[PDB]
Scaffold this active site. Sequence first.
Site, PDB file in Angstrom:
ATOM      1  N   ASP A 125       9.545  10.458   6.715  1.00 25.16           N
ATOM      2  CA  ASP A 125       8.940   9.623   5.682  1.00 25.16           C
ATOM      3  C   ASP A 125       7.489   9.216   5.953  1.00 25.16           C
ATOM      4  O   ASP A 125       7.226   8.221   6.623  1.00 25.16           O
ATOM      5  CB  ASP A 125       9.837   8.381   5.543  1.00 25.16           C
ATOM      6  CG  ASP A 125       9.465   7.501   4.383  1.00 25.16           C
ATOM      7  OD1 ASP A 125       8.417   7.714   3.753  1.00 25.16           O
ATOM      8  OD2 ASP A 125      10.246   6.574   4.105  1.00 25.16           O
ATOM      9  N   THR A 126       6.545   9.971   5.410  1.00 21.59           N
ATOM     10  CA  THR A 126       5.141   9.677   5.648  1.00 21.59           C
ATOM     11  C   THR A 126       4.666   8.391   4.986  1.00 21.59           C
ATOM     12  O   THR A 126       3.616   7.865   5.342  1.00 21.59           O
ATOM     13  CB  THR A 126       4.247  10.861   5.211  1.00 21.59           C
ATOM     14  OG1 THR A 126       4.467  11.151   3.831  1.00 21.59           O
ATOM     15  CG2 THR A 126       4.567  12.106   6.050  1.00 21.59           C
ATOM     16  N   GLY A 127       5.443   7.878   4.038  1.00 23.06           N
ATOM     17  CA  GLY A 127       5.089   6.643   3.363  1.00 23.06           C
ATOM     18  C   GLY A 127       5.554   5.422   4.153  1.00 23.06           C
ATOM     19  O   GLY A 127       5.303   4.278   3.765  1.00 23.06           O
TER      20      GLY A 127
HETATM   21  C1  LIG Z   1      13.305   7.578  -6.975  1.00 14.59           C
HETATM   22  O1  LIG Z   1      12.004   7.392  -6.357  1.00 14.59           O
HETATM   23  C2  LIG Z   1      11.750   6.531  -5.288  1.00 14.59           C
HETATM   24  C3  LIG Z   1      10.394   6.492  -4.833  1.00 14.59           C
HETATM   25  C4  LIG Z   1      10.022   5.652  -3.754  1.00 14.59           C
HETATM   26  C5  LIG Z   1      11.014   4.844  -3.129  1.00 14.59           C
HETATM   27  S1  LIG Z   1      10.597   3.808  -1.771  1.00 14.59           S
HETATM   28  O2  LIG Z   1       9.113   3.288  -1.868  1.00 14.59           O
HETATM   29  O3  LIG Z   1      11.602   2.604  -1.611  1.00 14.59           O
HETATM   30  N1  LIG Z   1      10.792   4.707  -0.286  1.00 14.59           N
HETATM   31  C6  LIG Z   1      12.061   4.585   0.513  1.00 14.59           C
HETATM   32  C7  LIG Z   1      12.748   5.913   0.949  1.00 14.59           C
HETATM   33  C8  LIG Z   1      13.758   5.736   2.091  1.00 14.59           C
HETATM   34  C9  LIG Z   1      13.501   6.543  -0.231  1.00 14.59           C
HETATM   35  C10 LIG Z   1       9.686   5.586   0.170  1.00 14.59           C
HETATM   36  C11 LIG Z   1       9.012   5.065   1.461  1.00 14.59           C
HETATM   37  O4  LIG Z   1       8.016   6.007   1.886  1.00 14.59           O
HETATM   38  C12 LIG Z   1       8.387   3.634   1.314  1.00 14.59           C
HETATM   39  C13 LIG Z   1       7.031   3.586   0.539  1.00 14.59           C
HETATM   40  C14 LIG Z   1       6.387   2.194   0.475  1.00 14.59           C
HETATM   41  C15 LIG Z   1       6.914   1.200  -0.398  1.00 14.59           C
HETATM   42  C16 LIG Z   1       6.326  -0.085  -0.450  1.00 14.59           C
HETATM   43  C17 LIG Z   1       5.202  -0.390   0.368  1.00 14.59           C
HETATM   44  C18 LIG Z   1       4.670   0.588   1.239  1.00 14.59           C
HETATM   45  C19 LIG Z   1       5.260   1.880   1.297  1.00 14.59           C
HETATM   46  N2  LIG Z   1       8.179   3.121   2.684  1.00 14.59           N
HETATM   47  C20 LIG Z   1       8.876   2.119   3.208  1.00 14.59           C
HETATM   48  O5  LIG Z   1       9.757   1.470   2.623  1.00 14.59           O
HETATM   49  O6  LIG Z   1       8.447   1.917   4.504  1.00 14.59           O
HETATM   50  C21 LIG Z   1       8.903   0.763   5.274  1.00 14.59           C
HETATM   51  C22 LIG Z   1       9.123   1.167   6.731  1.00 14.59           C
HETATM   52  O7  LIG Z   1       7.830   1.074   7.353  1.00 14.59           O
HETATM   53  C23 LIG Z   1       7.051   0.073   6.666  1.00 14.59           C
HETATM   54  O8  LIG Z   1       5.784   0.612   6.235  1.00 14.59           O
HETATM   55  C24 LIG Z   1       5.602   0.451   4.819  1.00 14.59           C
HETATM   56  C25 LIG Z   1       6.723  -0.470   4.341  1.00 14.59           C
HETATM   57  C26 LIG Z   1       7.796  -0.302   5.420  1.00 14.59           C
HETATM   58  C27 LIG Z   1      12.354   4.872  -3.565  1.00 14.59           C
HETATM   59  C28 LIG Z   1      12.716   5.711  -4.639  1.00 14.59           C
END
Ligand SMILES: COc1ccc(S(=O)(=O)N(CC(C)C)C[C@@H](O)[C@H](Cc2ccccc2)NC(=O)O[C@H]2CO[C@H]3OCC[C@H]32)cc1
Lengths: 99, 99
Positions: free
Chosen positions: A25-27
Amino acid sequence: PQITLWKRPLVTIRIGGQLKEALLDTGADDTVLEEMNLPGKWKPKMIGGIGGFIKVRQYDQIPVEICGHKAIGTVLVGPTPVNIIGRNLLTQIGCTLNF
Amino acid sequence: PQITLWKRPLVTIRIGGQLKEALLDTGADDTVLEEMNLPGKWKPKMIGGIGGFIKVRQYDQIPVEICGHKAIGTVLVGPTPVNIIGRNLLTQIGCTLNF
Ligand SMILES: COc1ccc(S(=O)(=O)N(CC(C)C)C[C@@H](O)[C@H](Cc2ccccc2)NC(=O)O[C@H]2CO[C@H]3OCC[C@H]32)cc1
């Protein structure tokens, strides 16, 4: 290896002696895994995602093998919808995004 | 290009003629953008991640330009803290994970 993204980038990892499936997960800044038993001391912490904050247990200098590649870093254990490998460990195994 | 993960993989995208920073996220199944005015009908939806679910609006066949590369797909608009480019669009610009 070269991983395309038509499918979720799920890989097998080995942590605390057991094999589990995790998403590259690069995000994610951090690595967070579903609740599990891990040796060593831990400290309570809080992290947020798109839907809010959750309570996690923080384990430092934990050994983890991602598809054969070794990494030693922080792992947060808590209520996550899926095991996620964040940039803190991705950089250790030389992972980059290319296109 | 080749994006390292020392920092968040933030890139510039073009939509509706306007630019903005978005995260190249392999952990995101779909693309999620910050609240914005978009013409066209949409469909209600809820997506979940760490912390819970958020309500978003689903738009289809939306054109986005990420790093001079064009991509057309569905985008979800909601109260997200960061713009997220997901695998639905990443696959179109031939983006891959490598290590
Ligand atoms: C159907 O489409 C979807 C698109 C996106 C998502 S999601 O954003 O919950 N997800 C969580 C992943 C495990 C699915 C992707 C992760 O890369 C998501 C992207 C994000 C969201 C909010 C703020 C910063 C970064 N990253 C994430 O939850 O990271 C956690 C863990 O490390 C921390 O760094 C950034 C926030 C914290 C969910 C569903």
